[PDB]
């Protein structure tokens, strides 16, 4: 199974300014089909603003752009990807502004 190595925002992090994106780095590459990061505010509204992209030169990295000037709130980045080894993986990265 692929595992998160690191993310920006980090899990349960408290940000100092509004982020432009959510970025996730996996220990092994992840595949194109069905990947996503969907980001929600605490009202359940979507705050990502673009389709999720696997980095063109690095299939370990997945990013999604965010709406500008997000307010102070608690957020949930819900992610899904298919591992290089075939296993579907998913999770949530909570963070706050």
Author numbering: 24 to 120
What did the authors write?
We purified the resulting YcnJCopC protein and crystallized it in its as-purified, apo form. We determined its structure to 0.160 nm (1.60 Å) resolution. The overall fold displays the typical β-barrel structure of a cupredoxin fold observed in other CopC proteins. Of those CopC homologs whose structures have been experimentally determined, YcnJCopC has the lowest RMSD with the Cu(II)-binding CopC protein from Methylosinus trichosporium OB3b. The main difference between YcnJCopC and these other proteins is a disruption of β4. This could, however, be a crystallization artifact, since we also observe electron density for triethylene glycol and a sulfate ion from the crystallization solution near this beta strand. Another His and an Asp from a DxH motif provide a third coordinating nitrogen and a coordinating oxygen, respectively. These three residues are conserved in YcnJCopC, and the crystal structure shows that these amino acids are close to one another, suggesting that they may be involved in Cu binding similar to other metalated proteins in this family. On the other hand, in its apo form, YcnJCopC has π–π stacking between the two imidazole rings of the two conserved His side chains, an interaction not accessible to YcnI because it lacks a second His ligand. Concurrently, in the absence of Cu, the two His ligands in YcnJCopC can engage in π–π stacking, as we observe in our crystal structure. Protonation of histidines also helps to stabilize these π–π interactions, so Cu binding may also destabilize π–π stacking.
